[PDB]
Design a binder for this molecule. Structure first.
Ligand SMILES: [Zn+2]
Ligand SMILES: [Zn+2]
Lengths: 64, 117
């Protein structure tokens, strides 16, 4: 495992998650901040609203 | 060559083989100018992309050179396609993507608009 939280920073499930542009993985339930993934805001909205067949995954469901 | 707008944000890529990864998109897109981000979405059962991906430049002019030259480029033995991806900023907080290049991403999932609600 690599923790049930964003491993790319020391932040956690805190109340600030609204502007942290968080996203849930699609084959595991871990949540991650998209800002730590170096993703732009529009880039985030696209890969977050991609179809249910194809989409981006967390650092343990795929290497990035 | 030509384009609908120069833009300064991320751009679209397609016609890729499943063997393509960010290291292939970086080496093929870096000669026009500096890149700052590349990501490939994947299919949940095979961990492969359907031949579509995204790229982001550090400069707005070099992104216009990508759509002007890489749209005729070739990778893995097949032709690729490149175009802008700024005129598709999602209307999150009001509706899902159904009105732009993001709509054809839904048509790509398999029509889907016959059940949109
Ligand atoms: Zn984080
Ligand atoms: Zn995951």
């Amino acid at each position: 495992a690599k923790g049930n939280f964003c491993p790319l920073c020391d932040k956690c499930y805190d109340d600030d998650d609204y502007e942290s542009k968080m996203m849930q993985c699609g084959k595991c339930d871990r949540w991650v901040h998209s800002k730590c993934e170096n993703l732009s805001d529009e880039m985030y909205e696209i890969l977050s609203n991609l179809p249910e067949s194809v989409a981006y995954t967390c650092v343990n469901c795929t290497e990035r | 060559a030509g384009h609908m707008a120069t833009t300064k944000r991320v751009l679209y890529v397609g016609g890729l083989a499943e063997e393509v990864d960010d290291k292939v998109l970086h080496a093929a897109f870096i000669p026009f100018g500096d890149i700052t981000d590349i990501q490939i979405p994947l299919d949940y059962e095979t961990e492969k992309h359907r031949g579509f991906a995204f790229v982001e430049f550090e400069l707005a002019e070099d992104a216009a050179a990508a759509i002007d030259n890489m749209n005729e480029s070739e990778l893995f033995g097949r032709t690729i396609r490149v175009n802008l991806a700024k005129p598709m900023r999602i209307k999150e907080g009001s509706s899902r993507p159904v009105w732009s290049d993001d709509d054809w991403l839904k048509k790509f999932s398999g029509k889907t608009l016959e059940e949109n609600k």
